[PDB]
Structure formats: structure tokens, C-alpha cells
Design a protein around this ligand. Structure first.
Ligand SMILES: Nc1ncnc2c1ncn2[C@@H]1O[C@H](COP(=O)(O)OP(=O)(O)O)[C@@H](O)[C@H]1OP(=O)(O)O
Ligand SMILES: O=C(O)[C@H](O)[C@@H](O)[C@H](O)[C@H](O)COP(=O)(O)O
Ligand SMILES: O=C(O)[C@H](O)[C@@H](O)[C@H](O)[C@H](O)COP(=O)(O)O
Lengths: 467, 467
């Protein structure tokens, strides 16, 4: 009469996680505030050991104790409400897993409150989209280690598994560390999508490639070092047609929506002093695509440059391919530097190689690329930035000229390349022993008496630039 | 008897503001938490109609009702501390004016709390530095309009004055609007400083100009449309020599510090959906300059390109000049669009032309340029973005090729130009009727069933991409 695990939230990720758990042999109670979505999941999944509940009291009473309840609810108010609804019905010792894309500070507060109340809480990221939620996602749990150990067996059962046999779940760290890692996974995902979008813009605008030629190009890139789930699905998207014979990609409205995690990643870079330019420009690229009416009006009044020969087709395709791969390297180097800054600030002692390992399969950014990062940290766990690791440093040596060529060409012909150009600016600033910030410090001392330090003597200084 | 106004906080900013007020013919009451700073100001200004108090009670009683108290203490808990110490002595209707560098949400909270208690609260920005606070700053107040009008006689007399005779102070809007506009002013200032730093980088690294040639160039640029206070002080900086007599700008550590406002501007753009790329990359350029140890390490490991010829000296200098001016236009277009988005979110009904007018003098970004923005809003107050105004469209028509040439050259030779790059990517995205966000929306629907809209049919769609 009782089920083993309960799942609250029957939208895409939640219903698929419930089906994932059930597929491992577990009996599962489900509940959704919009009671009609619960009905639908039951109707669509005859033969599965899912049992629907239509009041929170009955859902909670239906579970074996100590209870294991997974919440997959909308971030913010919604998750706070679901948790507050469950609370009066729970027993001390019950286990609450918030698997939603919750902002990490909310998880730090909740972990403190619920732990004090006697519950075992885990705030965990879950990554993999609809298919990954169903078949095996990457899971990144944070909270007290004792609470993790109570749910590790089930999380291991439903998680994706890498080619080497290792489950794509591991204890991330205390309190909000798991949701913070999920937030950065999503920021990295926004950057990978924007990098691919710029490659698409360059190949379509510079070479006038057709959608079949774009599909072909992405298929070839997917057979090499750029292989990844995002490139693999992009190759498919370019040949998808609607019932009318229209290529779907050309009738989809170009307003990219966002549900908060990329924005939060950039707001955290700003709080932590990390120069996270690529992912941030990817968020702003979504924002400006979301000003479609303004862009359509401006396109009718603002001038641009004339067309420019891209040159040999094969030569251009290889330069864009190299630019995309080096752009990814820069984005990940920025993202992982931010994980170390956050780890230091929030006292998480994150294990960067272990994080990269659980992103090898399951998650949206999965790609053999994550193994190159795992290996870099295995050789030097304290590495300050991935650009210094031999593998990455040598790709930058080999591919930076292609990236520079692509950015110069795009700027001359008018194709926007925010992330390829942020990648060049970051590479050339990170390797610069001296930047023009000496002038900025002089200006600040002149107009605001902010003082400055010198390269040849100790102390703080203030000058009368006037007299 | 009694003073029309008192100033709390006798550090440089508050004491200088009190002196500005006294110089206008007013008798000013002053008070500081540490009596010694007060005694100092008193001892230092013999003939000044400054009246010291050493108890908060006496200070408050010295003032004519409705009381006007200008609070210039450390932002944060110290401002709440100064507020909390004044309350018991205040009468309904009195006015507290916070001129600190306060985050606007704190001003919203205080304005609400104090209003409930019957007290007015004006959060005001003050721009111009130590000299400006003394001779004439730009003042940006928000709060109750009636309280502002009561104290406006005094503020209009201490403010800087524009070329048309108008004082650089105006009612900005309700609650936190003044502190929000001061924040944006500071984000714009960060952008102007970074654009100037890139121009310096390029002229020094590309043409090998000496500091004397840099001063000469900036002096020539300041005679024309670029005329601005920041360019004026930059040419002074380039010829300032040391004790020994070496150029001071060359011995300053290239680590740019910050006091929060730039970071705050970018975090607000992220909250509001505004693609504020230029100012945000200016903040990240300060962050990477502050990772000096990492940059020095990386400079010993990472490779870069071989320097290419810049060509004709005069021609290159003119291209950099044009790039700098068009970059400023783009940065201000982004900043004013953010002001419009904030005005809509926080219900301020901001008057953009009036905000541009009080930035014509007193403030750090003062420049003749602000009159072109003022003119644009006089003709079209609700214009969506400054790039659409005839004057700016024409500059972009004429100068974009130089900006493209400068970015392409910098990328080929390895000098980082994050804001010139962001300027070109924004211009080319804002004018693009169609962006590659159609592919981003397809990917999100493919992996997460996030749905999409179409350009040829109304409604919301989802595709089963796997079948
Ligand atoms: N206050 C609340 N209490 C409980 N569940 C809530 C909630 N607010 C949102 N959710 C759940 O959070 C899940 C995701 O909501 P959403 O609006 O973010 O969905 P989507 O992004 O897929 O359109 C849904 O299961 C939603 O329940 P409903 O289907 O009833 O909307
Ligand atoms: O890791 C994942 O499985 C995805 O990221 C998932 O969490 C979800 O699809 C997000 O909503 C995508 O982020 P944006 O909706 O904000 O595009
Ligand atoms: O308008 C002004 O008078 C300045 O902008 C002023 O507010 C101060 O000098 C800031 O501290 C500079 O900002 P940073 O210190 O963050 O560079």
C-alpha cells in the first residue's frame, strides 16, 4: 500500500525523473499542484508502477518511512510553497531532495532551516533535458555528507554512467554547492549554444551554406574533437522539416528565452570578481534577441557594411571550426575559474576534476571534451586556469590565428560575433603581463583621490596631477 | 538661532558639501560621530558660517522645520546607524537626504520605512569628486517630490552649472530613482574609462607613441566632438612626471580597483533583461586587471601573434579616434536603454533628457556629447534607443568602418579590445532583424521541450525532434 519514493512536480523534468526511478524497479508516488497533469502522466504511462495522489496529505502518507521525496518544481516561490505544504505532514528524519534549478542562496538557507527542523536535505542539480531525465542525467548533490549517503544508492541507480563505468553523480560539497555547480553547468551550456549560433551565422552569412550543407558541416565536426551532444543535435535540427516541407529552423522566431540560471551565473561572476565574459555575452545575446520588435525597427534605419568574399569554402569552414573549439576552451576556462572562486568564497573545497567527470555523460554539455578537463585537473588539481594546461595551451597556440581571422572577417562584414570576440579579448588580456589599467588607476586618483600602488616601491600613493 | 540645513559626516565629501553650501551664503550646522573631525573642520575654516554640534540631539534642534539633514557617512549599516540615531529627535515632515554611494534598493527600503513613520527621505547621487563637491557637483535626487522642492533652493545653488546657465540638479523621481541614476552614471564612467584605455593600448602598442605623443593626440581629440573631462585629465596624466622625473603613469600598478557601482549597474542590466555589454565588459576588464599574479604567470606560458604594421600614423590615429567616439555612442545607447527599462520596472517616469542635462557639467562623464543626447530626447522623449536618433545614426554611418578596422587590427596583432569589440557586436546585433537565436530556440525545444513561436503562424509550438 506504500511506495518507496515520491516525486512532486510533473512538468517535463519531474515526470521523466519519476519514470526514470520507476524504470529501476522502484514504486513511485507522484503529485502535482495542477492535478490534471498527474492524471495525464498516469494515462500516458500504463503499466508503470506510478501511483497518483491528489492531496499533499495523501501523497506524503503514501510513502515508506523514512520518506524520500524528490521535488522538481519551478524555482523560487513555487519550490518554497511545495516544501512548506509538505512540512506539516513529514516525520523527523524524512529526506527532502530539491532537484530543481534553485538559486544556490535559497538552498543555503533551506539547508540550514530544514536541517534544524530535523530533516535530511539535499539540494541537487539534475542535468540532461527530457531524455536525460528519463534515461540517466548528471546529478550534482550538495548538503551534509550524511544526508548524501542516505540517497547515494538511489541517485546512483538513476544517474547516467560514463564510458569508464563511473556514475555521473558524486557528492559535490556542503549546503548550496550542488545547485551552484548546476547553475555554472547551465551558464556553460548558454555559452556553448551561443558559440554554435555564431558558427552558424558565419557559415550561413559568409558562405551562404544551405541547411543541408550546415547539417553536413556539423556532422563532420561532430566526428572530431568537437563531438558533443549539442553539436550532435544541431546537425539534426538543420534537416528537420515541418509537415508543410518548411525547414523548421527558418520559421522558428529568433527570441531566445531564458529561465534564470545563465543570468545568475553572470551575477555571481560579478559578485566574485571573475571576468566571465563569454557566458555573460551569451546571456546578453539572448536578451537582445528578445528585443525583436526593436531589432526589426532598427534594421530599417541603421546602416551596415557591404558583402565581403569569404574565400575558399573548405578554408573558411576549418577556420570557423577552430574558432568554435578555441572559443569553447576559453568559455570553460572562465567557468572553471569561477567554480574555484566560488568554492573559496563559500567554503566548499570543490573537486573540479570530479565535477568535469560527472559532466562526461547525462548532462547537456556532455562531450569527450570534458575528459580533457578531467585529465588536466588529475595532473594538476590546483591549476589556476585551464588555458595553462598543456593540452589547452597547445590548442590555443595552433588555433588562435584561425579565431583572429574569423573575428576580423565577421567584424568587417557585419556578422555579430559577441562570444568569439570576447574569447580573443580574454585570451589577449589573460596573457598580458601589463594592461592599460595603469591609466584607469591614474584617472581614479586624479578625479576621486582613490590612491594607487607603484611597481618600484612599497606603499599607497596619491598625486596632485594638477600642480 | 537656527540653520536651514545641517550636514552629518565631516569626512572630505560631507565637509566639502557643507563648505559649498556655506559659500552660497548659508549658515550650516555640522555634526560627526567622532568630534575630532568636526573640531578639525572648525579649526580649518575660521571665517566660515559653520556651526558645530557634538550631540545628535543638539544638532537636530539647531535646524529649522521641516528639517533638512544631509547625511554623508559610510554607505551600508553606517547610514542606517546614522538614520536610527536621528529618528527619536525628528518631527513628522522632516527630511533626511542620503548623499552616500548607496545601492538603490536600500534607498527604496528606507524611503518606505521612514514614510510609514512620517519622515521624508531623499536618496541622492553626488558626482564630481572632492573638488566637485566643493565647487559644484552634479546632484541626482529621488524621493518625495514635495521634500525635494522644499530643499531645491539650496541644492540648485551648490550645483555645477551647464553652458546654458542651468544648474546640474533636477528632481529625478520617487524613492530610489536618484541613487539608481547615480549608479548608471558610474557604470557609464567605467565604460568611458575602458574605451579610453583601449585607445591608449592601441596607440602605444600599435604605433609606439611616446607619452608626449599620447598627450598631444588626446589634446587634439579634446578640441573636437570628443571634448570631455575624462579626455582632458588623460592628456594631463600623460605628461605628469615623477619625483625623479619619470612618467608617473608608467610606474603605477595596472590593477584597477572598484567601489561597487559598475558591478551594480551590470547586475541590474542582468535583472532587467538589458544587453549592457559594453559597461559590463568594462567591469570585467577591471576584474582581469586585478588578477595580476595570474596574468604574469600566464604571460610566461601563453603565446600570441607577431605584430603587424599599423600603416600611416595619421590615418591610424583618426581611426582610433572614430572608434572611441562610436564606442561611446554605443555605450550610452545601452545605458540609457537600461534607464528606460529601470524606469518601467520601478515606476519612476524618468525624464531622460533632463538626466542628460544634469550630466553636462559637474559629474565625471561631463562632456559636450551630453548635449547631443539632450537634443535627441528634446526631439523625441520616448525614443527607444539613442542609436535611432538622426545625429547618432549619422555618426554610426560615418564611423563604423573605422571601428571595424580598429577591432580587426587589434585582434590580428593581439591587443585586447573588449569594449570596442562589444560595441561592434552590439551594433551588428541591434540592427539585425534576424539573429541565430532561432537555432538556440530549436535546441532548447529539442532537449528541454521549452516550446517556440513561429514567424509564419501564431501560437506556441513544440516539435518531437527525435521522431
Ligand atoms: N506554488 C507551487 N506549488 C507546487 N508546485 C508548483 C508551484 N509553482 C509551480 N509549481 C510546479 O513547478 C513545475 C514547473 O512549473 P513551471 O511553470 O516552471 O513550468 P514550465 O517551465 O515547464 O512551463 C510544475 O510542475 C508546476 O506545477 P503546475 O503544473 O501546477 O504549474
Ligand atoms: O541541464 C539541463 O538539463 C537543462 O539546462 C535544464 O536544466 C533546462 O532545460 C533549463 O531550463 C535550460 O535553461 P534555460 O531554460 O533557461 O534555457
Ligand atoms: O561620480 C563620481 O564623482 C565618481 O564616479 C565617484 O562616485 C567615485 O570617485 C567612485 O568611487 C568612482 O567609482 P569607482 O571607485 O568604483 O572606480
Amino acid at each position: 500500500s506504500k511506495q518507496q519514493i515520491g516525486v512532486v512536480g510533473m512538468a517535463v523534468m519531474g515526470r521523466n525523473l519519476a519514470l526514470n526511478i520507476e524504470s529501476r524497479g522502484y514504486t513511485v508516488s507522484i503529485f502535482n499542484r495542477s492535478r490534471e497533469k498527474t492524471e495525464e502522466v498516469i494515462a500516458e504511462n500504463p503499466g508503470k508502477k506510478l501511483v497518483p495522489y491528489y492531496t499533499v496529505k495523501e501523497f506524503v502518507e503514501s510513502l515508506e518511512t523514512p520518506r524520500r521525496i524528490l521535488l522538481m518544481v519551478k524555482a523560487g516561490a513555487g519550490t518554497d510553497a511545495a516544501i512548506d505544504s509538505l512540512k506539516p505532514y513529514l516525520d523527523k528524519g524524512d529526506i527532502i531532495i530539491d532537484g530543481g534549478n534553485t538559486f544556490f542562496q535559497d538552498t543555503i538557507r533551506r539547508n540550514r532551516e530544514l536541517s534544524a527542523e530535523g530533516f535530511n536535505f539535499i539540494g541537487t542539480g539534475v542535468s540532461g533535458g527530457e531524455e536525460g531525465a528519463l534515461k540517466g542525467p548528471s546529478i550534482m548533490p550538495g548538503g551534509q555528507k550524511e544526508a548524501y549517503e542516505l540517497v547515494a544508492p538511489i541517485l546512483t541507480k538513476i544517474a547516467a554512467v560514463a564510458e569508464d563505468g563511473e556514475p555521473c553523480v558524486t557528492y559535490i560539497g556542503a549546503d548550496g554547492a550542488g545547485h551552484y555547480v548546476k547553475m555554472v553547468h547551465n551558464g556553460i551550456e548558454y555559452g556553448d549554444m551561443q558559440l554554435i549560433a555564431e558558427a552558424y551565422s558565419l557559415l550561413k552569412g559568409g558562405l551562404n551554406l544551405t541547411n543541408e550543407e550546415l547539417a553536413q558541416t556539423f556532422t563532420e565536426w561532430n566526428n572530431g574533437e568537437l563531438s558533443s551532444y549539442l553539436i550532435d543535435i544541431t546537425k539534426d535540427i538543420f534537416t528537420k522539416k515541418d509537415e508543410d516541407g518548411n525547414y523548421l529552423v527558418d520559421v522558428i522566431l529568433d527570441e531566445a528565452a531564458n529561465k534564470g540560471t545563465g543570468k545568475w551565473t553572470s551575477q555571481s561572476a560579478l559578485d566574485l570578481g571573475e571576468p566571465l565574459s563569454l557566458i555573460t555575452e551569451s546571456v546578453f545575446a539572448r536578451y537582445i534577441s528578445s528585443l525583436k520588435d526593436q531589432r526589426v525597427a532598427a534594421s530599417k534605419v541603421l546602416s551596415g557594411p557591404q558583402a565581403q568574399p569569404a574565400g575558399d569554402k573548405a578554408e573558411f569552414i576549418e577556420k570557423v571550426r577552430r574558432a568554435l573549439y578555441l572559443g569553447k576552451i576559453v568559455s570553460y576556462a572562465q567557468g572553471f575559474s569561477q567554480l574555484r572562486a566560488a568554492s573559496e568564497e563559500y567554503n566548499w573545497d570543490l573537486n573540479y576534476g570530479e565535477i568535469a567527470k560527472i559532466f562526461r555523460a547525462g548532462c547537456i554539455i556532455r562531450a569527450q571534451f570534458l575528459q580533457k578537463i578531467t585529465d588536466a585537473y588529475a595532473e594538476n588539481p590546483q591549476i589556476a586556469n585551464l588555458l595553462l594546461a598543456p593540452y589547452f595551451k597547445q590548442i590555443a597556440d595552433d588555433y588562435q590565428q584561425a579565431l583572429r581571422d574569423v573575428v576580423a572577417y565577421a567584424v568587417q562584414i557585419g556578422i555579430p560575433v559577441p562570444t568569439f570576440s570576447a574569447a580573443v579579448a580574454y585570451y589577449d588580456s589573460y596573457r598580458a603581463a601589463v594592461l592599460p589599467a595603469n591609466l584607469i588607476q591614474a584617472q581614479r586618483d586624479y578625479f576621486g583621490a582613490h590612491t594607487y600602488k607603484r611597481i618600484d616601491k612599497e606603499g599607497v600613493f596619491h598625486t596632485e596631477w594638477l600642480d
